[PDB]
Design a protein around this ligand. Structure first.
Ligand SMILES: [Hg+2]
Ligand SMILES: [Hg+2]
Ligand SMILES: [Hg+2]
Ligand SMILES: [Hg+2]
Length: 263
């Protein structure tokens, strides 16, 4: 049950004026492709606040990567889902090395040591967002991404033909994608969706990985890409949501760099 939106004043959408004339803003299966300019965040924020949405943000910070947590969480506090309930889950082998970062109200952090758990996510959050920790939020990352299942366009392949995508190409692998298949090349550093859809993804990925290991063949990205080929995501994030400015600059087609590699 979705309650009524309030009165809001904003510019009328123009049916005969395309949103962007430089990029694809919807997939062939009618999933939006989220670029700056495609969304009114005020409408979306209302929609998700009225549902009292809670978002889990999972990071794995092992060994030397704990060094990146401080900048990651600090910048998340400024840019990630500001205004909504956020639950950080930091998986680490060094719980004591996790920095004390000050969190805004309605936001919490759990440290989970690694050397009825998945069940925990189902009762605690509505969506899960899984990302790499050696990263920095530089601009808005908000509820526009939220959907049952989403992937993010790999920043070095978003203009490439499918032949050039570095999918798994060996037929013996469960991640195998032939040269004549593939919609996009998704990167493993930013994906998510509902808790249910994310658990299905990681479960299917874990089983495919074990089958490959059993067949003497050896990763994350290739399996994610196979999964999202066969289970089309309900939104697709533009490379705004995972960029490397040192490696790729700031091209015109990116009006914002939201989430980036660290110099
Ligand atoms: Hg638009
Ligand atoms: Hg995750
Ligand atoms: Hg992840
Ligand atoms: Hg996966």
């Amino acid at each position: 049950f979705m309650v009524s939106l309030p009165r809001m004043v904003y510019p009328q959408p123009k049916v005969l004026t395309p949103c962007r004339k430089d990029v694809l803003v919807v997939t062939p299966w009618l999933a939006p492709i989220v670029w700056e300019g495609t969304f009114n965040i005020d409408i979306l924020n209302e929609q998700f606040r009225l549902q009292n949405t809670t978002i889990g943000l999972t990071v794995f910070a092992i060994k030397k990567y704990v060094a990146f947590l401080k900048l990651f969480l600090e910048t998340a506090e400024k840019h990630f889902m500001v205004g909504h309930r956020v639950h950080y889950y930091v998986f680490t082998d060094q719980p004591a090395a996790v920095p004390r970062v000050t969190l805004g109200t309605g936001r919490q952090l759990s440290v989970l040591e690694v050397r009825f758990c998945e069940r925990r996510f189902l009762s605690e959050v509505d969506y899960l967002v899984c990302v790499d920790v050696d990263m920095e939020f530089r601009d808005h990352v908000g509820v526009e991404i939220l959907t049952p299942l989403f992937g993010t366009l790999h920043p070095g392949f978003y203009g490439s033909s499918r032949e050039a995508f570095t999918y798994e190409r060996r037929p013996q692998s469960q991640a195998y994608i032939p040269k004549d298949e593939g919609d996009f090349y998704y990167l493993g550093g930013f994906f998510g969706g509902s808790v249910q859809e994310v658990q299905r993804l990681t479960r299917a990925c874990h089983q495919a990985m074990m089958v490959d290991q059993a067949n003497g063949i050896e990763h994350d990205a290739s399996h994610l890409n196979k999964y999202l080929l066969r289970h089309k995501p309900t939104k697709v994030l533009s490379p705004e949501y995972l960029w490397d400015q040192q490696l790729l600059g700031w091209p015109a087609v990116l009006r914002k760099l939201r989430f980036t590699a660290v110099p």
